[PDB]
């Protein structure tokens, strides 16, 4: 029906680990059939796949395609033009996608368990937290010693923005529940965070016991024949 | 005090003008002040440690400090402060209802849904 505004960038979960970056840009508005027109102004040896449509709001269709151009033009600042055309009105609002600027780093904290859960001998719980990062894309993984845990042992919420003073920032949490015998053995755990405003793309924090231990302890044993209790 | 249950109960209003003074407003024996007519009463329930007093039709000048006092030998005097903040009354009644000469009247009174078990 009426044309709208839509955006789709490359995926971070494949941009930080592998080099299988795929661009896929969107512009919709469905009244007519296939009248396909592109803008891929760098097209340096890429062939755009197209496929079948899928389900939409009871009759309408929408189209897109993929360019595999991971030769670092995206984190340089190419603008990668997106603009439709049809036998229709030649007045688009356009999409021009690039690596964005004014980026900030996250600040990561890893919290110890509550002392109520320790004195019950069941599973205990840990909490990761990151806040202050400027685009809302982030990855969170857990480790045990050096082994990465499978990603169906832990829960991670989404990425939401904060109340602030002018500059806008974002935050995210996650939890992991382990057994109390593993905590009281002395095994360590870690939270890893990936983001694109970090220079080495990863940060770590690690926790165990003996981390927030106090540094001074006075023990006095008062024997018999010396009781002096006051009310 | 429970051991002084055959006493006589009073309700002050702390004036604070000269040095300090209780004009009495209502007693346990059936007297009330003139200018507080239709908006004050003292109730003996629940009893056994405690009586209650009801003061409605509030205005913003009704804020102040209020005292209660018994007639027995040991006297605790207890003070409560009535503040006035803005909002809406829960129960809802009409204005000042007249009467016809020679037929009936009927007056409604709503309530909200947290009062559905009271």
């Amino acid at each position: 029906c009426h044309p709208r505004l839509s955006l789709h960038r490359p995926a971070l979960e494949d941009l930080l680990l592998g080099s299988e970056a795929n661009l896929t840009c969107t512009l919709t508005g469905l009244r007519d059939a296939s009248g396909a027109t592109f803008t891929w102004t760098p097209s340096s040896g890429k062939s755009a796949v197209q496929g079948p449509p899928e389900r939409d709001l009871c009759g309408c269709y929408s189209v897109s395609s993929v360019l595999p151009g991971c030769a670092q033009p995206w984190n340089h600042g190419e603008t990668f033009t997106c603009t439709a055309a049809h036998p229709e009105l030649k007045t688009p609002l356009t999409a021009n996608i690039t690596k964005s600027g004014n980026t900030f780093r996250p600040e990561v904290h890893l919290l110890p368990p509550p002392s109520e859960e320790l004195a019950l001998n069941e599973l205990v719980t840990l909490t990761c937290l990151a806040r202050g990062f400027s685009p809302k894309d982030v990855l969170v993984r857990w480790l045990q010693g050096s082994q990465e845990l499978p990603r169906e042992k832990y829960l991670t919420w989404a990425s939401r923005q904060e109340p602030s003073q002018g500059t806008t920032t974002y935050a995210v949490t996650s939890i992991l529940r382990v057994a109390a015998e593993d905590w009281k053995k002395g095994e360590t755990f870690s939270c890893m965070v990936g983001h694109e405003a970090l220079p080495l793309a990863f940060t770590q924090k690690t926790i165990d016991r003996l981390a927030g231990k106090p540094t001074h302890i006075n023990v006095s044993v008062v024997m018999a024949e010396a009781d002096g209790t006051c009310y | 005090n429970r051991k002084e249950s055959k006493s006589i109960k009073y309700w002050c209003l702390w004036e604070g003008a000269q040095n300090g003074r209780c004009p009495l407003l209502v007693d346990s024996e059936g007297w009330v002040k003139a200018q507080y007519e239709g908006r004050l009463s003292l109730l003996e329930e629940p009893g056994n440690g405690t009586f209650t007093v009801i003061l409605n039709q509030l205005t913003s000048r009704d804020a102040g400090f209020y005292w209660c006092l018994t007639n027995g030998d040991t006297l605790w005097r207890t003070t409560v402060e009535i503040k006035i903040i803005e909002g809406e009354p829960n129960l809802k009644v009409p204005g000042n209802v007249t009467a016809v000469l020679g037929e009936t009247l009927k007056v409604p009174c709503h309530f909200p849904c947290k009062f559905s078990s009271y």
Binding site: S115, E116, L118, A119, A224, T229 | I85, G87
Partner: protein
């Protein structure tokens, strides 16, 4: 030693704490926590008479000393709601280590009076079981 965090009487433990702040170097202060335990050397494990030997092992968990469950009042918007303050006090079943000076403790013993036997009641702390 200024602000009392807990003063418990089933286990007879008391915990106070205090902030004592230096003005120079405002990044570091000290926070003190004082604990006092009084160990009874002549009480039984269950509190009746013939139970078991002297209790010889005494265990204190900080999360059960500081536990607070009597309800409170919170004002949210213009409302008074009643809230609980703890996860763990499901009703007792707590084992007490000492007596409490304002509660009294009795036992039941059978004795004979020539014919059949009665169900004589006996005070265990006589200062507190006076009927008045």
């Amino acid at each position: 030693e200024r602000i009392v965090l807990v003063d418990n009487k089933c286990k007879c433990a008391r915990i106070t704490s205090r902030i004592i702040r230096s003005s120079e170097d405002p990044n570091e202060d000290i926070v003190e926590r004082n604990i006092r335990i009084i160990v009874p050397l002549n009480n039984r494990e269950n509190i009746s008479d013939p139970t078991s030997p002297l209790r010889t092992r005494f265990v204190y968990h900080l999360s059960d000393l500081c536990k607070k469950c009597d309800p409170t009042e919170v004002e949210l918007d213009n409302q008074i709601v009643t809230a609980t303050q703890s996860n763990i006090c499901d009703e007792a079943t707590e084992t007490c280590y000492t007596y409490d000076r304002n509660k009294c403790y009795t036992a039941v013993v059978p004795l004979v009076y020539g014919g059949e036997t009665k169900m004589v009641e006996t005070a265990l702390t006589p200062d507190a079981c006076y009927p008045d």
